[PDB]
Design a protein around this ligand. Structure first.
Ligand SMILES: [Mn+2]
Ligand SMILES: [Mn+2]
Ligand SMILES: [Mn+2]
Ligand SMILES: [Mn+2]
Ligand SMILES: [Mn+2]
Ligand SMILES: [Mn+2]
Lengths: 314, 314, 314
């Protein structure tokens, strides 16, 4: 299968500059060279150039609505184009708002896809529930078909068309949810595994259940959106919103290993890696490294070892 | 339900001064302001003033028997008074010897209560088994009805009346027990889950079993005595006796989340937080913070999120 | 049962000097004095003196073949001698190459023994698969009967005689395996539990299964070879090849506790503790300490507590 890496150096989805440096950091750490050594064909598309919208005035509380809106429409066009050529897309964030474009362009080709969202946050705040106007916490609000018409039309997002429903998305790692958000997921009935559920069942049971829930009936493509702040701050500290009590390096790799074994991975997002939020040069390498490990794991790398087929090592 | 915080700035239960600063540290971190934001009514009673007994001579090996004895009789009177007004009591330690008063005053109103003890130690050393004379490691020895008359009468504790039996107390987190103690719990048959049991069954199974064991038949009030050194030193380092291989931040929050879901929480002790034993200013904030989190969790705060009933966030 | 500690201050199995200091560090930390306080009889044999072979030229890629070969033949003679006197042997590494002699001498008395290998590596590289010539990553290649004749005869190992087969060895903790190695274990069908298997089943299930696999039919002696780098670098950092995502202090103590409960422990290796690779004096004490804890756990020490039989502590 072919792989294409698409860099999205965007940070207008939140107040913390530096996230747009994520893609460069992940390459510097050799992400693309390490993927070539797997069983997949890899091509690096490069970084999209995002045009900054002049006089992008705030729409009520939301900030940079036109800049974030345009950025995502441009990304969505690239993802669909590549998805079309029969290739698995790999999106390197900046901030989580880029999830809008990524999933949108993906669904245009595979409208029957399912989303697995690993994050410490649900990011399902609408333009009216948000205490802040940062769009990195509203990504899933622009994608749900059960939320369409539940909030005004934001300047720059007219092109967006709800592509997935509450029943097509499972959350793993939740531990810092806002009131309005916890309301939306209880109301719409979204399947989720917060940290208490992981603690209760174990990572194994969790993955065994998210699959039967999504792939139980039909076998459809999988889009994995991975917010680096889903793992515990001790593992991925260089991020804008770290929260204690997260998934461990081991649990993170287990998820991806199980997702690889399905053979259905079609889309991937490595979001929120902010190289500038490292307290020490090493806290940044730690973050960059585990993110790289999570991507290599998604494409074949196992902890038990790997060896080439038809080669007699003895 | 109403909540009342009672501060017990006492440290005579052991040689390490500084524990009496625990209550002040927990307030400074905003414990009381954060509880008001829950669904409970909160009132801060303040800190009890403990009269130091002059010429409090050692009773054989035990130290400060009259000072610790008086301190606890004074606490027991406050707890019963507040328990009486139909309020859940929240005791902020100093040292673990204050468990005596806390549980005593509690049982006077609810003689049919059960105790869940989270700690790395059993603290069931009697005045004769103790290698040290510190009374913070003898709290549960003054409360058991199966131990009454098994050790002389210590000056200052004549008012104490055994209020619970071996079958009414479950230990979770045990990993540093003395020989004499491990004997007393095997003899009296106390239900316990040491770290090996947690590792074997998982935090979920552990809680599922402590409940059926205690609440299986009758539904009685629950008294949670939480010794901060039950969590691993990496999470709660500012304590007098840290021991590697403890419960994790996640497991700690799971316990309380399950205890909240019962609706039976009637008493609470946050013991052994010693602000002065922090190697760095941050090791102390880490300890204070997780302790605060454990108390908010006990009263409704969930990791999956919380939202106010009857409010339409959409 | 009697115990005999044998020190193997050897480091020729790899490029990192300092490992030969392991045995001294573990004694300094009081390993022998703490074992005497258990229910076992302990005798300290001392450290073997290893003669350095002059002009020990490299055999193709392998380094120090004659020095490592001789060292192990000398160790195997001591282990068999002591095993013969009906005593459990305890080998204190240097490097993992000393596993050759240790297991060899052991099997000479108990040819029906089984091996439990706790390590982050399989160390089953043959003289032809190794990317490096270091023999610490080839120990298991000189012991398997299914590999005999699959690689030339290395100078210094003519005395070695394959003593165990693929079906008699279980690996726990794998997470950094070379291609050729992962090939050998898939081909020969070696039973293993890498980190993903531990994550999936839990330490309890893992131990429950390694036992039924090995002791299911016949009850045979157990040889536990423990490579300190099997535990996560946060617990045992002073080692030549640390790898993130390992077993925890708790899991490590659980394994040994279960192994003790079998009553079949006959051999023990505490390998790869390198006192000189500590970044700080404390990273070395942390390593030394957990290793000491693992050995005391192997011989009776439980986390739930221990008390002497026939003594009435009340
Ligand atoms: Mn997030
Ligand atoms: Mn997110
Ligand atoms: Mn205590
Ligand atoms: Mn304690
Ligand atoms: Mn090894
Ligand atoms: Mn190793």
């Amino acid at each position: 299968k072919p792989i294409e890496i698409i860099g999205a150096p965007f940070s207008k989805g939140q107040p913390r500059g530096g996230v747009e440096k994520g893609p460069a950091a992940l390459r510097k750490a050799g992400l693309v060279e390490k993927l070539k050594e797997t069983e997949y064909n890899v091509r690096d598309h490069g970084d999209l150039a995002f045009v900054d919208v002049p006089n992008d005035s705030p729409f009520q509380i939301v900030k940079n609505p036109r800049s974030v809106g345009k950025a995502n429409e441009q990304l969505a066009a690239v993802v669909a184009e590549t998805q079309k050529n029969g290739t698995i897309s790999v999106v390197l964030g900046g901030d989580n708002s880029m999830a809008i474009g990524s999933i949108s362009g993906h669904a245009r080709v595979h409208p029957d896809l399912c989303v697995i969202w690993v994050d410490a946050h649900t990011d399902i705040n609408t333009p009216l529930t948000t205490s802040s106007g940062n769009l990195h916490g509203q990504p899933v609000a622009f994608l749900l078909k059960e939320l369409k018409g539940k909030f005004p039309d934001v300047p720059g997002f007219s092109w967006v068309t709800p592509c997935i429903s509450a029943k097509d998305i499972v959350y793993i790692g939740l531990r810092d949810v806002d009131p309005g958000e916890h309301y939306i997921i209880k109301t719409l009935g979204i399947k989720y595994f917060s940290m208490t559920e992981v603690d209760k069942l174990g990572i194994g049971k969790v993955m065994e259940e998210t699959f039967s829930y999504l792939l139980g009936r039909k076998k459809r493509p999988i889009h994995l959106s991975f917010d680096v702040d889903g793992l515990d701050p001790v593992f991925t500290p260089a991020t804008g919103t770290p929260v204690v009590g997260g998934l461990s390096y081991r649990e993170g790799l287990y998820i991806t290993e199980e997702i690889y074994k399905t053979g259905l991975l079609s889309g991937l997002d490595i979001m929120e890696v902010n190289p500038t939020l490292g307290k020490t040069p090493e806290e940044v390498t730690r973050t960059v490294n585990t993110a790289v490990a999570l991507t290599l794991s998604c494409f074949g790398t196992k902890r038990e070892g790997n060896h080439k087929p038809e080669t007699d090592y003895l």
